[PDB]
Amino acid sequence: DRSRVFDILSNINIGWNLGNTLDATGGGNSVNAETSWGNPKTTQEIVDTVNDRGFNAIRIPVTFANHLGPAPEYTISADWLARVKEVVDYAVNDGMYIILDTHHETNYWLKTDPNNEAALCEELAAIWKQLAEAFKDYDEKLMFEGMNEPRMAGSAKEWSGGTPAERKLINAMNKAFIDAVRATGGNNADRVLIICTYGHNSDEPTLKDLEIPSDPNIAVALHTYTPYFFTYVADGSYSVWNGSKKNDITWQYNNIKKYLIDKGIPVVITETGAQFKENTEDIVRWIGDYVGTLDQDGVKCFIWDNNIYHGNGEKFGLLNRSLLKWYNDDIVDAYVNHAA
Ligand SMILES: [Mg+2]
């Protein structure tokens, strides 16, 4: 029975990612990494604003690599650990549901070479042991997500669920993550731990090869920016949403129900969203079809928000953090009022 995890997740309206922030990789071994991709330093007020709008869950992506000491201890720089804790505490201060992950480790040490399994598992465990210790006394609203889109960057199947060998490696890494956290005890004994597929991919072969831990306090995370050609800008992309492509969402969701939901495994969509293409009305309709599909089985999602809206880049921005005002209240309304 995994009902405790379902109970905790049911308290979430919809979630929000503090993107391009603690996950940013500039600045070297410095707290300045946080602002290295152009976002302002996070404040209590920024977090309050997210909560107040109706996003009562926040995902805090963090890239640790540059703040780590040498193997085998991989000691997290004290200044960085303290700053990560400060940001998590903004959310705890507001009684929010929280996901803390490791993030762009994939730029550094987290390269899914099956021949390097031991070193990979050991580094992931060494990092999570330290995080679990730091947050050992935190309550059940704080969840850990072991990895983010773990893959081999540049590989042929980087974004299609990788290879069978890589997927076995992911299973091993998910276990190492769970094992390291549970070993620290305290509230970490039953904290919700969120494992993932290769690249957070949700294609059938990827789901089919996913090992499900016997640990009853886990959830499986996926990233479904579906359809890719609506949500991203690429040759072949479109900004119009009239429902004709809803099938792309339905098909994929059916594989998620087949392999996870209908088996009683908790699923969380820890990233999704649609880049702004001067198509407010279309995104509002897509949200209805996409989030409405997840709502059928009470699956929760967290929206990616990188604070990019007017400028160049992937325009996932929703909250203008400097002004504490939302870039687009119609899109934001559709998200937070999804259950209405
Ligand atoms: Mg306890």
Q: What SS3 class is residue 335?
A: helix
One DSSP character per residue, 145-185 reads E--SS-B-TTSTTTTTT--HHHHHHHHHHHHHHHHHHHTT-
Beta 325-326 vs 319-320: how paired, if at all? antiparallel
Q: What SS3 class is residue 325?
A: strand
Domain 1-340 CATH (choose: 3.20.20.450, 3.20.20.80, 3.40.50.12280, 3.10.180.10): 3.20.20.80
The structure tokens 């006394």 sit at 137
DSSP assigned state of 56: -
What's the 91 CA to ligand 1 centre distance in angstroms? 21
- Cα separation, 315 vs 55, in Å, equals 19
First to last CA, the chain: 30
Q: What SS3 class is residue 86?
A: helix
Phi and psi at residue 84, to the nearest 5°: -60, -45
Query: Who contacts 334 (Cβ-Cβ below 8 Å, separation ≥6)?
Result: 283, 284, 287, 288, 291
To 10 degrees, what angle do helices 164-182 and 117-134 make? 30
DSSP assigned state of 68: B
- Cα separation, 198 vs 222, in Å, equals 9
The structure tokens 């390097």 sit at 116
Burial 273-295 (b: 16+ CB within 10 A, else e): bbbbbebeebbbbbbbbbbebbe
Q: Entry resolution in angstroms?
A: 1.8
What's the 265 CA to ligand 1 centre distance in angstroms? 22
What's the 80 CA to ligand 1 centre distance in angstroms? 27
What's the 187 CA to ligand 1 centre distance in angstroms? 4
Q: Tell me which of 145, 158, 166, 271 is the catalytic residue.
A: 271
Q: What SS3 class is residue 15?
A: strand
- Do residues 49 and 336 make contact, with C-beta atoms less than 8 angstroms apart? no
- Cα separation, 44 vs 205, in Å, equals 42
Burial 307-326 (b: 16+ CB within 10 A, else e): bbbeeeebbbbbbebeeeeb
- CA–chain centroid gap for 21, Å, is 13
Residue type, 6: F
Cis peptide bond prior to 72, omega within 30° of 0: yes
List the domain boundaries for the chain: 1-340
The structure tokens 């929000």 sit at 16
Phi and psi at residue 154, to the nearest 5°: 95, -15
**CB-based burial of residue 169 (10 Å sphere; 0-12 exposed, 13-18 middle, 19+ buried)?**
buried
Q: Tell me which of 105, 123, 149, 166 is the catalytic residue.
A: 149
Q: What SS3 class is residue 286?
A: helix
DSSP assigned state of 45: H
Burial 103-119 (b: 16+ CB within 10 A, else e): bbbbeebbbbebeebee
The sign of the dihedral angle between the CA atoms of 248, 251, 254, 255 is negative
Question: What experimental approach yielded this model?
Answer: X-ray
- Cα separation, 340 vs 335, in Å, equals 10
What's the 5 CA to ligand 1 centre distance in angstroms? 14
Instruction: Show the DSSP H helices in the chain as ranges.
Output: 3-9, 44-53, 78-93, 117-134, 164-182, 204-208, 228-231, 246-259, 280-295, 329-336
- Do residues 337 and 325 make contact, with C-beta atoms less than 8 angstroms apart? no
The structure tokens 């590989």 sit at 155
What's the 141 CA to ligand 1 centre distance in angstroms? 13
| Catalytic status, residue 149 | yes
Burial 194-230 (b: 16+ CB within 10 A, else e): bbbbbbbbbbebbbebbeebebebbbbbbbbbbbeeb
Do you know the residue count of the chain? 340
Phi and psi at residue 89, to the nearest 5°: -65, -30
| Catalytic status, residue 140 | no
- CA–chain centroid gap for 225, Å, is 12
What's the 149 CA to ligand 1 centre distance in angstroms? 30
- Do residues 290 and 251 make contact, with C-beta atoms less than 8 angstroms apart? no
